[PDB]
Amino acid sequence: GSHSMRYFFTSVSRPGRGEPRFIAVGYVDDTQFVRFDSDAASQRMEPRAPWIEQEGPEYWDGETRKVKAHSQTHRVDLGTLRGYYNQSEAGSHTVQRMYGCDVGSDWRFLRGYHQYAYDGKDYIALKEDLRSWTAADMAAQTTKHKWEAAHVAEQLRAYLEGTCVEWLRRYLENGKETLQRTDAPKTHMTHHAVSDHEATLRCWALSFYPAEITLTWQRDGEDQTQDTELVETRPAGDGTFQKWAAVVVPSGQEQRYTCHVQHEGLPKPLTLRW
């Protein structure tokens, strides 16, 4: 089983008055652990998981300083991109940033990322080799030329392959009671009559962790795409996730249909039949 640590940053300009809105969040897998809201009264990096609260004053001062610094470079970025694109000063724009590392089944480094977006579209991204850049347009090419001359990639590479992996493993251990606990989906099937001739079978998957799951419907041992509906994975609000898959069947033929569930918490795939 693989693990990841991510940091997401969003900066939305306020042309009418003041400084831009800045929201930063940190994840370990599908568990959020830290936050920063420019509109909050504390103006500090705040804990969002019980296992991170054990970190000392040095950590919280270091993380607050770094996120406040980022809030200011993204304010500058919004101003620099408005100039590159020859945009109006009256409009509100968005700068997004994301970075993080993954550890493989062997528990060592798998891959690292560091990418940006402007108004919801790709701007610049660090490639898989962590040495080169992918620039989407000519405004981004200007950023690439500057970053390659400044040897920025090398500084990001040291973190992604080193410090990022080391701290992800630390968190995974300190929060093992929850972070390394796999919660298999609580499954059941419901039956709803649509008419005297047809019926809806709904296959439920509740209270699971991680979010990654596969729900498939089969008729007489083969996959069925026709007459099915599947909602996207949604959060329950307590840290767990939910999902369902339904199928319209002729009444009296429910037995031919089987729901197959795949999840990391299940040692072998689950088969449900009405």
Binding site: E63, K66, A69, H70, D77, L81, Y116, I124, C164
Partner: peptide, 10 residues
């Protein structure tokens, strides 16, 4: 923990 390298402007 976040990256301590902060000298990156677009």
């Amino acid at each position: 923990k976040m990256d301590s390298f902060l000298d990156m402007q677009l």
